[PDB]
Write a protein that binds this ligand. Structure first.
Ligand SMILES: Cc1ncc(COP(=O)(O)O)c(CNCC(=O)O)c1O
Ligand SMILES: Cc1ncc(COP(=O)(O)O)c(CNCC(=O)O)c1O
Lengths: 398, 396
């Protein structure tokens, strides 16, 4: 065997599929989002506008977030210095968990290094807590969820994206005594569409299944307090477990689940992914807590209203140019190119000629043949760079 | 069908084995480590001394670490705002990766949210890159590694802890054409013992296997530049992949792997655990980079020398009291109680009566019947506090 040969092959394979990814090295200018310095491969520096980021509401530069982080650094230092069990549980962490519990109106919450870890650990550990559990998973569920669901051996059923009738057909065919869980997303990251929360809850209630919703692309942005789509539709009480991130609209890092005291205490107690890893830096927890707290206020609601507005304006302007934009009514604005190489070519031109950064999105992030640009207008994308983006797209489709 | 009934069952089972864990709520006093405020369950506040933390060298309060973190917050904000692919690759990450590569003298490095993620993602993704891979794993490998090894279906072979002859017997039995990888640790977290790097590398070279070493409890602390035990024994060139953390001796958060550019580029390109998660906050990256850079200098060497010294003094003083301490020559100082309930009882008393915090360690962190206290003397545990601790133990 030559390990080096096999590596080469593995990499070659990416180039052959047109899906080898080049990262763009940037430094966002705090206080001037969405401006960033792009560190070009030739050693030069160029001002660009970030159009694809997930700091959806500009919270990453918010003074109340940054103040709380500076404070915590000075009070307790750089990290926790331990796992939750061995000296890594601090007030910042439980203050954060209580903030999150409140958000989702749940008894408890549990913080992980990332929402990825939260899904992976929780979904796999649930198989252990509920012997013979059957997990029903939306075909476009995020990788973190897929990974959690398959991690431990056990029955899984994949239902066609947003297809509640297929869901019913699958669930009704299975052993009615077996514990069941349905896992889906409120907002799907790449299509920008909504999961049918009500219909799924109705099915879960009819068949005695647990509901597990990933609201990673909704928290901070939907509902009167930024608790997500289930809050918007008045459905939070119908959801057994929430999964969210602190890294996107909340502007910081980390993730969580929110659920009853029982569910949390059990996950907390049996999930290797939670037990065996250093807890989040207290500064990270301080920032995220401040972010959530802020987004619950009417001042946070202004940021949401502004976001929605800018998304509507961007979609209008792009349709007005005759462009391949799919509109499912969310803040995500995908423009489908359908080819991994041509997507990178359009992205490359936007970056270098117009200072427009929108990463080309390919497999495995989206299905092959659906490679796309994915715009994320935020409160800080004013009615003038929208103007700057559109003009560049127009100049470019010549 | 009845979900809560299952939950109460799973929880009870923890109380029944005595292994139900109560967390201790603390706030470390920056600039005064190892002092911390303990937030007692009754609402009171009490000054305590942290004796079980993993901020092994006090880097979590180091001014160069904190300065780099404050700077980054002001320059770029709270988080990256994206995955490495979608806007979260920054200069801070790239400089941090170069710093690590340099530490292990490797072509490349890759940063993950944690060393846990790095092990899990890497070990499981290697099965995909090397079809039919057989992984040989030390029986006391960390959970993160076990989890990475089992995640994807595929052949695994568990060798008796530190038993190189069992390793040989296993590997010689297997198909000689199959790709092989041996996964072990340089310093084992709970026993505080060293893995036999040279003997494992010899076996790996004889049978054409990859070597994967987890140096999580060694980086920053061993070798003339803090690169770990392999650096200390002059063996880094013989290790295919390094796994390390930025959250322990380095004082911050996150983890990584270090290997050749092709090895890194393939892991990066294939591992869902790397692709689908937000990149580390630039401030975290800045701090860790400053921490690694600092620990490579002669000034860092002073912190290591001091740590080793304090560990030796603690071990001496504990044996001089007749105590169940196992000494494998590392900075970790475990005192074996052997029972989960009595271990918590001793720990409780040390906290409440003496202001000594040392979490009681039980299953699944260590095998049942080997429950213990695990002391971690650092540069900041001056001869005064060591003297304080031993006196406290004695009277108990
Ligand atoms: C050997 C080993 N490897 C990896 C990890 C994962 O490190 P992260 O904190 O970067 O996720 C740990 C943490 N084990 C916890 C402890 O030391 O008690 C460990 O002990
Ligand atoms: C639906 C979904 N769920 C979970 C995560 C994981 O979140 P963390 O970064 O906090 O681990 C992501 C990130 N995927 C980023 C994206 O698709 O834009 C996601 O898109």
């Amino acid at each position: 065997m030559d390990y080096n040969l096999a590596l080469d092959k593995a990499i070659q394979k990416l180039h052959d599929e047109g899906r080898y990814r080049t990262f763009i090295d940037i430094e966002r200018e705090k206080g001037a989002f969405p401006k960033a310095q792009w560190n070009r491969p030739d050693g030069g520096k160029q001002d660009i506008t970030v159009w694809c980021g997930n700091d959806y509401l500009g919270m990453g530069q918010h003074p109340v977030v940054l103040a709380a982080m500076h404070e915590a650094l000075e009070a307790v230092g750089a990290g926790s210095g331990g796992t939750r069990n061995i000296s890594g549980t601090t007030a910042y962490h439980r203050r954060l968990e209580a903030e999150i519990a409140g958000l989702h109106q749940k008894e408890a919450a549990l913080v992980f290094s990332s929402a990825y870890n939260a899904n992976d650990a929780t979904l796999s550990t649930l198989r252990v807590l509920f012997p013979g559990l059957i997990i029903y998973s939306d075909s476009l569920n995020h990788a973190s969820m897929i990974e959690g669901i398959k991690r431990n051996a056990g029955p899984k059923r994949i239902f066609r994206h947003n297809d509640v009738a297929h869901l019913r057909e699958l669930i009704a065919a299975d052993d009615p005594a077996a514990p069941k869980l349905i896992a889906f997303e409120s907002v799907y990251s790449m299509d920008g569409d909504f999961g049918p929360i009500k219909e799924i809850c109705d099915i879960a209630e009819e068949f005695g299944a647990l509901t597990y919703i990933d609201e990673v692309h909704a928290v901070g942005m939907y509902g009167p307090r930024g608790a997500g789509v289930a809050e918007r539709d008045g459905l939070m009480h119908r959801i057994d477990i929430f999964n969210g991130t602190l890294a996107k609209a909340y502007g910081v890092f980390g993730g969580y689940i929110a659920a009853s005291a029982r569910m949390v205490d059990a996950v907390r107690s049996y999930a290797p992914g939670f037990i065996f890893s250093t807890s989040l830096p207290p500064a990270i927890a301080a920032g995220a807590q401040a972010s959530i707290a802020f987004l619950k206020t009417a001042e946070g609601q202004k940021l949401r209203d502004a976001q929605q507005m800018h998304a509507k304006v961007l979609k209008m302007r792009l349709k007005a140019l005759g462009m391949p934009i799919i509109d499912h009514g969310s803040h995500i604005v995908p423009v489908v190119i359908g080819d991994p190489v041509h997507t990178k070519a359009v992205s490359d031109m936007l970056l270098s000629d117009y200072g427009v950064y929108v990463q080309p999105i390919n497999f495995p992030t989206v299905p092959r043949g659906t490679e796309r640009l994915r715009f994320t207008p935020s409160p800080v994308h004013d009615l003038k760079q929208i103007d700057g983006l559109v003009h560049a797209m127009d100049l470019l489709w010549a």
